[PDB]
DNA sequence: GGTAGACCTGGACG
DNA sequence: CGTCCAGGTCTACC
């Protein structure tokens, strides 16, 4: 059929495949786990989303990565688009490298991925990374996800349409910046996280030098560019290492939550050291995260993102 | 300097 | 039905 969410056996002239292992790739172990909250499963193992400013459906068989794309006469992915595609997934990457050094070094982690194959970080936009983690805040992937669809669809780019649903791109500064933004966003249901999303548009584009200072952090440290984004409204410690991690190229940023938090005692028996508290805080917050850093290494954020995603299946 | 409490909400249970 | 919960952050105050 012409219209409606595609499927590899509907229209196969339509999807072109990459290389890729179930092992190197589980796109139901990433994509709704809490890294990015725009892809949705329309049809039984195939999700949807926006991808390098154009909507996707993706599927996967025991080898291959199956690909299609909805722009003009509808045709299969170009190998330019395709790698746009590597591209997000970090594809080359190797996952079987970085699974085999962590289960080296760590016993439990070992335990854990011979059941978890196939978690590796998307390689995400600043931009969406840094509202829709604002909005993270004290809030459950779910709810998180629908209160992302109401700010794209409200103020985001329009895209095409299948089926009943209107894919919208991301928000940009300036939109989410405007008037009455946050009002909007209030009537969107985002509470008080509706606040910082205008104040953080506003402090960008105002204060801080605008898109160029948050892209140019990718070439900056992670030290560094932990500090400049903790100081935008709403970003925190743990919504800055996601950011880091998920978007700036930081792999060792290390998202501490009370996710990693129960799974560092409960796994690890961890416990504060030089902190003053015994539970979450930002010293302890902190420390942890040089713990699963010392314990990982220079991919700690990516062993987090494993552990984190096989605690959602909790 | 290291906390306790305020700020929003739709599914979750008991 | 009423308290609890989820990828927190901010800040007045001890
Ligand atoms: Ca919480
Ligand atoms: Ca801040």
Same mark, same amino acid.
């Given at each position: 059929?012409?219209? &409606? ?24 172990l ?8 725009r @892809? ?11 991808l ?43 996952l /079987?490298?970085?699974?085999?050094? @962590? ?7 070992? $335990?854990? /991925?011979?059941?978890?194959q ?7 936009? !600043? ?5 829709s983690?604002?909005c993270?805040?004290? %809030?459950?992937?779910?709810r ?9 669809? /409200?103020? &985001?780019?329009? +895209?095409?349409? +299948? ?24 009537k969107?249901?985002? &509470? ?11 402090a ?6 605008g ?36 978007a700036?190229?930081? !792999?060792?940023?290390? !998202? ?22 015994? &539970?979450?805080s930002?010293?302890?917050?902190? $420390?942890?995260? %040089? ?24």
């Amino acid at each position: 059929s012409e219209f &409606g969410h595609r499927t590899l056996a509907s229209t196969p002239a339509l999807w072109a495949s990459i290389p890729c292992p179930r092992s190197e790739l589980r796109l139901d172990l990433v994509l709704p786990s809490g890294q990015s909250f725009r @892809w949705r499963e329309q049809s039984p193992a195939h999700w949807s989303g926006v991808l390098a400013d154009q909507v996707w459906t993706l599927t996967q068989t025991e080898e291959q990565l199956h690909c299609t794309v909805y722009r003009s006469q509808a045709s299969r992915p170009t190998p330019d688009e395709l790698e746009a595609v590597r591209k997000y997934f970090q594809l080359d990457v190797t996952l /079987a490298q970085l699974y085999h050094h @962590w289960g080296s070094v760590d016993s439990h982690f070992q $335990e854990v /991925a011979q059941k978890f194959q196939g978690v590796r970080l998307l390689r995400q936009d !600043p931009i969406e990374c840094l509202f829709s983690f604002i909005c993270s805040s004290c %809030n459950n992937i779910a709810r998180i996800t629908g209160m992302v669809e109401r700010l794209c669809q /409200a103020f &985001g780019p329009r +895209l095409i349409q +299948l089926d009943d649903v209107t894919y919208h791109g991301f928000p940009s500064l300036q939109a989410l910046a405007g008037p009455e933004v946050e009002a909007h966003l209030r009537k969107l249901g985002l &509470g008080y996280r509706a606040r910082y999303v205008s104040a953080s548009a506003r402090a960008i584009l105002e204060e801080q030098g605008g898109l160029a200072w948050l892209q140019q952090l990718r070439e900056s440290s992670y030290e560094e560019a932990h500090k400049a984004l903790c100081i935008l409204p709403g970003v925190g410690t743990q919504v800055a290492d996601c950011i880091c991690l998920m978007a700036l190229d930081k !792999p060792q940023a290390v !998202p501490v939550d009370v996710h990693m938090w129960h799974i560092a005692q409960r796994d690890y028996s961890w416990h504060p050291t030089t902190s003053q508290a015994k &539970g979450p805080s930002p010293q302890t917050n902190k $420390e942890l995260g %040089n713990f699963f850093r010392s314990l990982w290494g220079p991919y700690a954020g990516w062993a987090q993102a494993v552990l984190f995603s096989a605690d959602l299946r909790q």
